[PDB]
Symmetry: C7
Amino acid sequence: GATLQDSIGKQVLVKLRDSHEIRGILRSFDQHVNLLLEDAEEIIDGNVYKRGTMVVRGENVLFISPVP
Amino acid sequence: ISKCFATLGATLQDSIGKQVLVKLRDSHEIRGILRSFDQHVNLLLEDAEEIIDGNVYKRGTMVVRGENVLFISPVPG
Amino acid sequence: TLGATLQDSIGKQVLVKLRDSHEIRGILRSFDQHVNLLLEDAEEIIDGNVYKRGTMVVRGENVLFISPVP
Amino acid sequence: FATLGATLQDSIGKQVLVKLRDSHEIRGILRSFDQHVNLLLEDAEEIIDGNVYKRGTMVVRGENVLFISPVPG
Amino acid sequence: ATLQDSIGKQVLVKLRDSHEIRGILRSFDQHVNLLLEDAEEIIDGNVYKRGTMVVRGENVLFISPVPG
Amino acid sequence: FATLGATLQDSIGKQVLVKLRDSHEIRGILRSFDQHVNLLLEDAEEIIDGNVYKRGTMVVRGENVLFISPVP
Amino acid sequence: ATLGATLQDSIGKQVLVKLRDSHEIRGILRSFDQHVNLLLEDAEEIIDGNVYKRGTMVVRGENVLFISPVP
Protein backbone atom coordinates (compact mmCIF):
# COMPACT_ATOMS: atom_id res chain seq x y z
CA GLY A 1 0.00 0.00 0.00
CA ALA A 2 2.39 2.60 1.31
CA THR A 3 5.08 1.49 -1.14
CA LEU A 4 2.67 0.69 -3.96
CA GLN A 5 1.10 4.12 -3.56
CA ASP A 6 4.55 5.70 -3.85
CA SER A 7 5.16 3.64 -6.96
CA ILE A 8 2.18 4.80 -9.05
CA GLY A 9 3.59 6.08 -12.36
CA LYS A 10 6.84 4.22 -11.75
CA GLN A 11 8.22 1.06 -13.35
CA VAL A 12 7.94 -1.94 -11.14
CA LEU A 13 9.29 -5.48 -11.33
CA VAL A 14 6.67 -8.14 -10.61
CA LYS A 15 7.27 -11.88 -10.31
CA LEU A 16 4.45 -14.40 -10.23
CA ARG A 17 4.00 -18.09 -9.55
CA ASP A 18 5.20 -20.42 -12.37
CA SER A 19 8.39 -18.35 -12.89
CA HIS A 20 6.92 -15.35 -14.65
CA GLU A 21 8.83 -12.05 -14.64
CA ILE A 22 7.04 -8.84 -15.72
CA ARG A 23 7.96 -5.16 -15.74
CA GLY A 24 5.51 -2.30 -16.17
CA ILE A 25 4.40 1.17 -15.13
CA LEU A 26 2.13 0.76 -12.13
CA ARG A 27 -1.16 2.60 -12.70
CA SER A 28 -3.33 1.08 -9.97
CA PHE A 29 -3.41 -1.66 -7.33
CA ASP A 30 -5.70 -2.87 -4.53
CA GLN A 31 -5.51 -4.64 -1.15
CA HIS A 32 -5.57 -8.03 -2.99
CA VAL A 33 -2.49 -6.93 -4.96
CA ASN A 34 -4.41 -7.00 -8.24
CA LEU A 35 -2.53 -4.68 -10.62
CA LEU A 36 -3.07 -2.59 -13.67
CA LEU A 37 0.23 -1.99 -15.50
CA GLU A 38 0.96 0.08 -18.62
CA ASP A 39 3.81 -0.32 -21.16
CA ALA A 40 4.10 -3.78 -19.55
CA GLU A 41 6.70 -6.36 -20.71
CA GLU A 42 7.47 -10.03 -20.03
CA ILE A 43 11.10 -11.14 -19.55
CA ILE A 44 11.29 -14.70 -20.89
CA ASP A 45 14.62 -16.56 -21.20
CA GLY A 46 16.38 -13.19 -21.28
CA ASN A 47 14.20 -11.84 -24.04
CA VAL A 48 11.88 -8.85 -23.61
CA TYR A 49 8.37 -9.11 -25.07
CA LYS A 50 6.36 -5.87 -24.93
CA ARG A 51 2.68 -6.29 -24.01
CA GLY A 52 1.26 -2.86 -23.33
CA THR A 53 -1.72 -2.79 -20.97
CA MET A 54 -1.83 -5.68 -18.54
CA VAL A 55 -4.08 -6.57 -15.65
CA VAL A 56 -2.56 -8.98 -13.12
CA ARG A 57 -4.48 -11.07 -10.55
CA GLY A 58 -2.94 -10.53 -7.13
CA GLU A 59 -3.40 -14.19 -6.06
CA ASN A 60 -0.28 -15.21 -8.01
CA VAL A 61 2.02 -12.28 -7.13
CA LEU A 62 5.22 -13.23 -5.31
CA PHE A 63 6.72 -9.74 -5.00
CA ILE A 64 6.68 -6.23 -6.45
CA SER A 65 9.68 -3.94 -6.38
CA PRO A 66 10.06 -0.53 -7.96
CA VAL A 67 12.90 -0.65 -10.44
CA PRO A 68 15.89 1.45 -9.18
CA ILE B 1 -14.18 -8.39 -10.23
CA SER B 2 -16.89 -6.45 -8.30
CA LYS B 3 -14.77 -4.60 -5.76
CA CYS B 4 -11.97 -4.39 -8.35
CA PHE B 5 -13.11 -2.02 -11.10
CA ALA B 6 -10.03 0.19 -10.80
CA THR B 7 -7.62 -2.62 -11.41
CA LEU B 8 -9.27 -5.42 -13.26
CA GLY B 9 -12.79 -4.39 -14.20
CA ALA B 10 -12.35 -1.25 -16.20
CA THR B 11 -9.71 -2.72 -18.52
CA LEU B 12 -11.76 -5.83 -19.17
CA GLN B 13 -14.85 -3.71 -19.77
CA ASP B 14 -12.79 -1.63 -22.21
CA SER B 15 -11.36 -4.76 -23.91
CA ILE B 16 -14.70 -6.27 -24.94
CA GLY B 17 -14.34 -7.13 -28.63
CA LYS B 18 -10.57 -6.74 -28.73
CA GLN B 19 -7.97 -9.53 -29.00
CA VAL B 20 -6.30 -10.30 -25.64
CA LEU B 21 -3.26 -12.36 -24.62
CA VAL B 22 -4.13 -14.44 -21.53
CA LYS B 23 -1.54 -16.51 -19.56
CA LEU B 24 -2.68 -19.27 -17.19
CA ARG B 25 -1.12 -21.42 -14.44
CA ASP B 26 1.02 -24.36 -15.72
CA SER B 27 2.55 -22.26 -18.48
CA HIS B 28 -0.41 -21.98 -20.83
CA GLU B 29 -0.60 -19.11 -23.33
CA ILE B 30 -3.88 -18.31 -25.15
CA ARG B 31 -4.95 -15.44 -27.42
CA GLY B 32 -8.57 -14.71 -28.32
CA ILE B 33 -11.18 -11.97 -28.77
CA LEU B 34 -12.69 -11.04 -25.48
CA ARG B 35 -16.48 -11.19 -25.83
CA SER B 36 -17.49 -11.58 -22.19
CA PHE B 37 -16.46 -12.09 -18.57
CA ASP B 38 -17.95 -12.47 -15.11
CA GLN B 39 -17.38 -11.52 -11.47
CA HIS B 40 -14.94 -14.42 -11.10
CA VAL B 41 -12.88 -13.41 -14.16
CA ASN B 42 -14.05 -16.41 -16.17
CA LEU B 43 -13.64 -15.41 -19.81
CA LEU B 44 -15.34 -15.97 -23.18
CA LEU B 45 -12.97 -15.82 -26.10
CA GLU B 46 -13.89 -16.19 -29.75
CA ASP B 47 -11.40 -17.29 -32.39
CA ALA B 48 -9.09 -18.33 -29.48
CA GLU B 49 -5.81 -20.14 -30.01
CA GLU B 50 -3.19 -21.85 -27.80
CA ILE B 51 0.52 -21.15 -28.29
CA ILE B 52 2.37 -24.36 -27.32
CA ASP B 53 6.17 -24.53 -27.91
CA GLY B 54 5.91 -21.56 -30.23
CA ASN B 55 3.24 -23.35 -32.29
CA VAL B 56 -0.33 -21.98 -32.74
CA TYR B 57 -3.32 -24.27 -32.10
CA LYS B 58 -6.64 -22.68 -33.11
CA ARG B 59 -9.65 -23.61 -30.96
CA GLY B 60 -12.47 -21.29 -31.82
CA THR B 61 -14.81 -20.62 -28.88
CA MET B 62 -13.17 -20.91 -25.49
CA VAL B 63 -14.48 -20.54 -21.91
CA VAL B 64 -11.50 -19.90 -19.52
CA ARG B 65 -11.70 -20.25 -15.75
CA GLY B 66 -10.59 -17.05 -14.10
CA GLU B 67 -9.27 -18.96 -11.15
CA ASN B 68 -6.17 -19.93 -13.10
CA VAL B 69 -5.61 -16.66 -14.94
CA LEU B 70 -2.21 -14.98 -14.39
CA PHE B 71 -2.79 -11.81 -16.49
CA ILE B 72 -4.83 -10.49 -19.40
CA SER B 73 -3.26 -8.05 -21.83
CA PRO B 74 -5.07 -6.63 -24.88
CA VAL B 75 -2.58 -7.10 -27.83
CA PRO B 76 -1.09 -3.75 -28.98
CA GLY B 77 -2.49 -2.80 -32.38
CA THR C 1 -22.63 -15.09 -22.08
CA LEU C 2 -20.24 -17.77 -20.73
CA GLY C 3 -23.37 -19.54 -19.64
CA ALA C 4 -25.19 -19.46 -22.95
CA THR C 5 -22.09 -20.60 -24.87
CA LEU C 6 -21.62 -23.64 -22.66
CA GLN C 7 -25.36 -24.31 -22.83
CA ASP C 8 -24.94 -24.31 -26.59
CA SER C 9 -22.29 -27.06 -26.34
CA ILE C 10 -24.42 -29.61 -24.51
CA GLY C 11 -24.62 -32.63 -26.79
CA LYS C 12 -21.40 -31.66 -28.61
CA GLN C 13 -17.73 -32.70 -28.36
CA VAL C 14 -15.50 -30.34 -26.43
CA LEU C 15 -11.80 -30.11 -25.58
CA VAL C 16 -11.07 -29.60 -21.84
CA LYS C 17 -7.56 -28.93 -20.51
CA LEU C 18 -6.98 -29.32 -16.79
CA ARG C 19 -4.23 -28.46 -14.30
CA ASP C 20 -1.08 -30.64 -14.59
CA SER C 21 -1.09 -30.87 -18.38
CA HIS C 22 -4.20 -33.08 -18.76
CA GLU C 23 -6.10 -32.94 -22.04
CA ILE C 24 -9.50 -34.55 -22.40
CA ARG C 25 -12.21 -34.59 -25.11
CA GLY C 26 -15.80 -35.70 -24.71
CA ILE C 27 -19.49 -35.02 -25.34
CA LEU C 28 -20.63 -32.29 -22.88
CA ARG C 29 -23.81 -33.71 -21.19
CA SER C 30 -24.10 -31.64 -18.03
CA PHE C 31 -22.33 -28.86 -16.13
CA ASP C 32 -22.87 -26.74 -13.03
CA GLN C 33 -21.94 -23.30 -11.74
CA HIS C 34 -18.58 -24.51 -10.45
CA VAL C 35 -17.87 -25.90 -13.94
CA ASN C 36 -17.93 -29.47 -12.71
CA LEU C 37 -18.62 -31.51 -15.90
CA LEU C 38 -20.27 -34.67 -17.01
CA LEU C 39 -18.78 -35.98 -20.22
CA GLU C 40 -19.89 -38.90 -22.32
CA ASP C 41 -17.75 -40.90 -24.77
CA ALA C 42 -14.80 -39.09 -23.13
CA GLU C 43 -11.13 -39.80 -23.79
CA GLU C 44 -7.77 -38.79 -22.47
CA ILE C 45 -5.00 -37.64 -24.90
CA ILE C 46 -1.58 -38.54 -23.52
CA ASP C 47 1.61 -38.20 -25.57
CA GLY C 48 -0.54 -38.60 -28.63
CA ASN C 49 -2.24 -41.79 -27.44
CA VAL C 50 -6.03 -41.77 -27.11
CA TYR C 51 -7.50 -43.64 -24.16
CA LYS C 52 -11.27 -44.07 -24.24
CA ARG C 53 -12.82 -43.59 -20.79
CA GLY C 54 -16.57 -43.45 -21.52
CA THR C 55 -18.54 -41.46 -18.90
CA MET C 56 -16.40 -38.96 -16.97
CA VAL C 57 -17.13 -36.53 -14.24
CA VAL C 58 -14.75 -33.47 -14.15
CA ARG C 59 -14.15 -31.20 -11.14
CA GLY C 60 -14.28 -27.57 -12.17
CA GLU C 61 -11.69 -26.57 -9.63
CA ASN C 62 -8.99 -28.01 -11.84
CA VAL C 63 -10.42 -26.99 -15.21
CA LEU C 64 -8.39 -24.51 -17.30
CA PHE C 65 -10.60 -24.05 -20.31
CA ILE C 66 -13.35 -25.72 -22.36
CA SER C 67 -13.68 -25.28 -26.14
CA PRO C 68 -16.03 -26.98 -28.65
CA VAL C 69 -14.06 -28.95 -31.22
CA PRO C 70 -15.01 -27.83 -34.75
CA PHE D 1 -26.46 -32.20 -10.66
CA ALA D 2 -26.41 -35.38 -12.62
CA THR D 3 -23.02 -33.57 -13.07
CA LEU D 4 -21.14 -35.06 -10.18
CA GLY D 5 -23.42 -37.11 -7.94
CA ALA D 6 -25.60 -38.67 -10.58
CA THR D 7 -22.68 -40.71 -12.05
CA LEU D 8 -21.15 -41.38 -8.75
CA GLN D 9 -24.49 -42.58 -7.48
CA ASP D 10 -24.70 -44.95 -10.38
CA SER D 11 -21.13 -46.24 -9.98
CA ILE D 12 -21.38 -47.41 -6.38
CA GLY D 13 -20.18 -51.02 -6.18
CA LYS D 14 -18.41 -50.72 -9.55
CA GLN D 15 -14.75 -50.14 -10.47
CA VAL D 16 -13.84 -46.56 -11.19
CA LEU D 17 -10.77 -44.67 -12.53
CA VAL D 18 -9.67 -41.61 -10.63
CA LYS D 19 -6.80 -39.27 -11.47
CA LEU D 20 -5.45 -36.77 -8.97
CA ARG D 21 -3.23 -33.67 -8.99
CA ASP D 22 0.53 -34.52 -9.27
CA SER D 23 -0.05 -37.29 -11.85
CA HIS D 24 -1.61 -39.94 -9.61
CA GLU D 25 -3.73 -42.66 -11.22
CA ILE D 26 -5.88 -44.92 -9.06
CA ARG D 27 -8.57 -47.52 -9.76
CA GLY D 28 -10.98 -49.04 -7.29
CA ILE D 29 -14.49 -50.05 -6.38
CA LEU D 30 -16.48 -46.98 -5.36
CA ARG D 31 -18.11 -47.69 -1.97
CA SER D 32 -19.15 -44.10 -1.13
CA PHE D 33 -18.58 -40.40 -1.84
CA ASP D 34 -19.82 -37.05 -0.60
CA GLN D 35 -20.51 -33.55 -1.80
CA HIS D 36 -16.84 -32.57 -1.69
CA VAL D 37 -16.07 -35.58 -3.94
CA ASN D 38 -14.17 -37.28 -1.13
CA LEU D 39 -14.27 -40.98 -1.96
CA LEU D 40 -14.15 -44.35 -0.31
CA LEU D 41 -12.74 -47.09 -2.53
CA GLU D 42 -12.21 -50.77 -1.86
CA ASP D 43 -9.76 -53.16 -3.52
CA ALA D 44 -8.06 -49.99 -4.73
CA GLU D 45 -4.78 -49.88 -6.57
CA GLU D 46 -2.34 -47.34 -7.90
CA ILE D 47 -1.02 -47.35 -11.49
CA ILE D 48 2.55 -46.07 -11.30
CA ASP D 49 4.74 -46.27 -14.40
CA GLY D 50 2.34 -48.75 -15.92
CA ASN D 51 2.66 -51.11 -12.95
CA VAL D 52 -0.18 -51.86 -10.58
CA TYR D 53 0.12 -51.51 -6.82
CA LYS D 54 -2.76 -52.94 -4.84
CA ARG D 55 -3.70 -50.94 -1.76
CA GLY D 56 -7.02 -52.27 -0.50
CA THR D 57 -9.23 -49.74 1.24
CA MET D 58 -8.56 -46.11 0.31
CA VAL D 59 -10.00 -42.78 1.37
CA VAL D 60 -9.35 -40.00 -1.24
CA ARG D 61 -9.70 -36.28 -0.62
CA GLY D 62 -11.91 -34.66 -3.21
CA GLU D 63 -9.81 -31.54 -3.20
CA ASN D 64 -7.17 -33.10 -5.50
CA VAL D 65 -9.50 -35.01 -7.75
CA LEU D 66 -9.20 -34.28 -11.46
CA PHE D 67 -11.81 -36.68 -12.76
CA ILE D 68 -13.63 -39.87 -12.09
CA SER D 69 -14.77 -42.28 -14.75
CA PRO D 70 -16.43 -45.69 -14.27
CA VAL D 71 -14.28 -48.31 -15.99
CA PRO D 72 -16.02 -49.31 -19.32
CA GLY D 73 -15.42 -52.88 -18.30
CA ALA E 1 -15.60 -43.91 9.15
CA THR E 2 -12.57 -45.59 7.65
CA LEU E 3 -10.05 -43.71 9.80
CA GLN E 4 -11.83 -44.65 13.05
CA ASP E 5 -11.45 -48.28 12.03
CA SER E 6 -7.76 -47.74 11.38
CA ILE E 7 -6.82 -46.30 14.75
CA GLY E 8 -3.88 -48.44 15.87
CA LYS E 9 -3.13 -49.90 12.45
CA GLN E 10 -0.52 -48.97 9.84
CA VAL E 11 -1.67 -46.68 7.10
CA LEU E 12 -0.05 -45.57 3.85
CA VAL E 13 -0.45 -41.84 3.25
CA LYS E 14 0.59 -39.93 0.03
CA LEU E 15 0.82 -36.16 0.03
CA ARG E 16 1.16 -33.45 -2.63
CA ASP E 17 4.67 -33.08 -4.07
CA SER E 18 5.21 -36.84 -4.29
CA HIS E 19 5.66 -37.63 -0.58
CA GLU E 20 4.97 -41.20 0.60
CA ILE E 21 4.63 -42.04 4.35
CA ARG E 22 3.59 -45.09 6.48
CA GLY E 23 2.86 -45.00 10.19
CA ILE E 24 0.49 -46.24 12.87
CA LEU E 25 -2.60 -44.03 12.91
CA ARG E 26 -3.10 -42.72 16.48
CA SER E 27 -5.55 -39.93 15.85
CA PHE E 28 -7.26 -37.79 13.23
CA ASP E 29 -9.71 -34.90 12.88
CA GLN E 30 -12.29 -33.40 10.55
CA HIS E 31 -9.58 -31.61 8.55
CA VAL E 32 -7.93 -34.95 7.89
CA ASN E 33 -4.87 -34.00 9.97
CA LEU E 34 -3.18 -37.19 11.17
CA LEU E 35 -1.06 -38.18 14.13
CA LEU E 36 1.15 -41.12 13.21
CA GLU E 37 3.53 -43.08 15.46
CA ASP E 38 6.50 -45.19 14.32
CA ALA E 39 6.14 -43.24 11.05
CA GLU E 40 8.55 -43.49 8.19
CA GLU E 41 9.16 -41.85 4.86
CA ILE E 42 9.74 -43.79 1.56
CA ILE E 43 12.10 -41.76 -0.62
CA ASP E 44 13.56 -43.07 -3.83
CA GLY E 45 12.58 -46.52 -2.49
CA ASN E 46 14.64 -46.05 0.69
CA VAL E 47 12.97 -45.87 4.07
CA TYR E 48 13.70 -43.22 6.65
CA LYS E 49 12.32 -43.91 10.17
CA ARG E 50 10.86 -40.77 11.74
CA GLY E 51 8.81 -41.75 14.75
CA THR E 52 5.97 -39.48 15.74
CA MET E 53 4.70 -37.32 12.93
CA VAL E 54 1.76 -35.00 12.64
CA VAL E 55 0.56 -34.51 9.04
CA ARG E 56 -1.57 -31.66 7.76
CA GLY E 57 -4.76 -32.78 6.01
CA GLU E 58 -4.55 -29.96 3.47
CA ASN E 59 -1.89 -31.80 1.46
CA VAL E 60 -3.25 -35.32 1.76
CA LEU E 61 -3.97 -37.20 -1.47
CA PHE E 62 -5.14 -40.49 0.06
CA ILE E 63 -4.93 -42.65 3.11
CA SER E 64 -4.89 -46.41 2.77
CA PRO E 65 -4.76 -48.92 5.67
CA VAL E 66 -1.89 -51.26 4.78
CA PRO E 67 -3.39 -54.73 4.02
CA GLY E 68 -2.40 -57.07 6.86
CA PHE F 1 -6.18 -30.65 19.47
CA ALA F 2 -5.80 -34.45 19.59
CA THR F 3 -3.99 -34.40 16.26
CA LEU F 4 -1.77 -31.40 15.81
CA GLY F 5 -2.22 -29.65 19.15
CA ALA F 6 -1.03 -32.26 21.62
CA THR F 7 2.10 -33.15 19.66
CA LEU F 8 3.12 -29.54 19.05
CA GLN F 9 2.50 -28.70 22.71
CA ASP F 10 4.48 -31.80 23.59
CA SER F 11 7.31 -30.84 21.25
CA ILE F 12 8.11 -27.42 22.68
CA GLY F 13 11.85 -27.41 23.41
CA LYS F 14 12.65 -30.38 21.23
CA GLN F 15 14.32 -30.76 17.79
CA VAL F 16 11.66 -31.27 15.05
CA LEU F 17 12.03 -32.21 11.32
CA VAL F 18 9.64 -30.11 9.18
CA LYS F 19 9.06 -30.68 5.47
CA LEU F 20 7.34 -28.04 3.37
CA ARG F 21 5.87 -27.74 -0.12
CA ASP F 22 8.37 -27.52 -3.03
CA SER F 23 10.69 -30.07 -1.42
CA HIS F 24 12.11 -28.02 1.44
CA GLU F 25 13.47 -29.83 4.49
CA ILE F 26 14.17 -27.98 7.78
CA ARG F 27 15.19 -29.01 11.32
CA GLY F 28 15.03 -26.78 14.40
CA ILE F 29 14.11 -26.55 18.07
CA LEU F 30 10.41 -25.87 18.36
CA ARG F 31 9.90 -22.76 20.53
CA SER F 32 6.30 -21.75 19.74
CA PHE F 33 3.45 -22.32 17.31
CA ASP F 34 0.08 -20.71 16.72
CA GLN F 35 -3.49 -21.50 15.56
CA HIS F 36 -2.48 -21.94 11.95
CA VAL F 37 0.57 -24.06 12.54
CA ASN F 38 3.01 -21.18 11.92
CA LEU F 39 6.17 -22.19 13.76
CA LEU F 40 9.03 -20.54 15.60
CA LEU F 41 12.24 -22.54 15.37
CA GLU F 42 15.58 -21.79 17.03
CA ASP F 43 18.95 -23.19 15.90
CA ALA F 44 17.25 -23.95 12.62
CA GLU F 45 18.88 -25.39 9.57
CA GLU F 46 17.91 -26.19 5.98
CA ILE F 47 18.96 -29.47 4.38
CA ILE F 48 19.61 -28.92 0.65
CA ASP F 49 21.17 -31.46 -1.71
CA GLY F 50 22.45 -33.32 1.36
CA ASN F 51 24.09 -30.19 2.85
CA VAL F 52 23.23 -28.34 6.03
CA TYR F 53 22.77 -24.58 5.94
CA LYS F 54 22.50 -23.14 9.44
CA ARG F 55 19.99 -20.34 9.69
CA GLY F 56 19.40 -19.72 13.34
CA THR F 57 15.99 -18.28 14.21
CA MET F 58 13.21 -19.10 11.74
CA VAL F 59 9.51 -18.24 11.39
CA VAL F 60 7.76 -20.92 9.24
CA ARG F 61 4.30 -20.52 7.67
CA GLY F 62 1.94 -23.31 8.59
CA GLU F 63 0.23 -23.03 5.26
CA ASN F 64 3.02 -24.79 3.48
CA VAL F 65 3.88 -27.34 6.13
CA LEU F 66 3.55 -31.07 5.08
CA PHE F 67 4.44 -32.65 8.44
CA ILE F 68 6.29 -31.97 11.71
CA SER F 69 8.16 -34.84 13.28
CA PRO F 70 10.08 -34.69 16.57
CA VAL F 71 13.51 -36.16 15.88
CA PRO F 72 13.89 -39.50 17.69
CA ALA G 1 8.61 -16.77 22.29
CA THR G 2 5.92 -15.21 20.13
CA LEU G 3 6.30 -15.32 16.35
CA GLY G 4 5.15 -11.70 16.29
CA ALA G 5 7.72 -10.70 18.88
CA THR G 6 10.39 -12.46 16.83
CA LEU G 7 9.66 -10.58 13.64
CA GLN G 8 9.35 -7.31 15.56
CA ASP G 9 12.87 -7.78 16.94
CA SER G 10 14.14 -8.45 13.39
CA ILE G 11 12.98 -5.08 12.08
CA GLY G 12 16.04 -3.19 10.79
CA LYS G 13 17.98 -6.46 10.38
CA GLN G 14 18.81 -8.47 7.27
CA VAL G 15 16.55 -11.50 6.82
CA LEU G 16 16.57 -14.48 4.44
CA VAL G 17 13.11 -15.09 2.96
CA LYS G 18 12.25 -18.05 0.75
CA LEU G 19 9.08 -18.33 -1.23
CA ARG G 20 7.15 -20.93 -3.21
CA ASP G 21 8.71 -21.85 -6.61
CA SER G 22 12.26 -21.84 -5.15
CA HIS G 23 12.71 -18.08 -4.79
CA GLU G 24 15.41 -16.88 -2.35
CA ILE G 25 15.52 -13.26 -1.21
CA ARG G 26 17.54 -11.31 1.30
CA GLY G 27 16.68 -7.87 2.60
CA ILE G 28 16.39 -5.45 5.46
CA LEU G 29 13.07 -6.12 7.24
CA ARG G 30 11.14 -2.84 7.52
CA SER G 31 7.52 -3.87 8.02
CA PHE G 32 5.30 -7.00 8.30
CA ASP G 33 1.62 -7.71 9.04
CA GLN G 34 -0.37 -10.61 10.48
CA HIS G 35 -0.47 -12.21 6.98
CA VAL G 36 3.31 -12.21 6.83
CA ASN G 37 3.21 -9.70 3.98
CA LEU G 38 6.64 -7.96 4.09
CA LEU G 39 8.35 -4.71 3.25
CA LEU G 40 12.07 -5.20 2.70
CA GLU G 41 14.61 -2.57 1.75
CA ASP G 42 18.01 -3.05 0.04
CA ALA G 43 16.48 -6.35 -1.03
CA GLU G 44 18.13 -8.70 -3.47
CA GLU G 45 17.31 -11.95 -5.18
CA ILE G 46 19.75 -14.88 -5.18
CA ILE G 47 19.36 -16.78 -8.50
CA ASP G 48 21.86 -19.56 -9.35
CA GLY G 49 24.39 -18.07 -6.93
CA ASN G 50 24.01 -14.68 -8.57
CA VAL G 51 22.86 -11.69 -6.46
CA TYR G 52 20.38 -9.31 -8.15
CA LYS G 53 19.84 -6.16 -6.17
CA ARG G 54 16.24 -4.95 -6.26
CA GLY G 55 15.91 -2.27 -3.59
CA THR G 56 12.46 -1.81 -2.02
CA MET G 57 10.23 -4.92 -2.23
CA VAL G 58 6.82 -5.84 -1.01
CA VAL G 59 6.44 -9.60 -0.57
CA ARG G 60 3.11 -11.36 -0.39
CA GLY G 61 2.74 -13.50 2.73
CA GLU G 62 0.62 -16.02 0.81
CA ASN G 63 3.74 -17.45 -0.80
CA VAL G 64 6.21 -17.15 2.00
CA LEU G 65 7.86 -20.42 3.15
CA PHE G 66 10.03 -19.04 5.95
CA ILE G 67 11.74 -15.84 7.23
CA SER G 68 15.06 -16.09 9.10
CA PRO G 69 17.18 -13.16 10.39
CA VAL G 70 20.72 -13.66 8.91
CA PRO G 71 23.02 -14.72 11.90
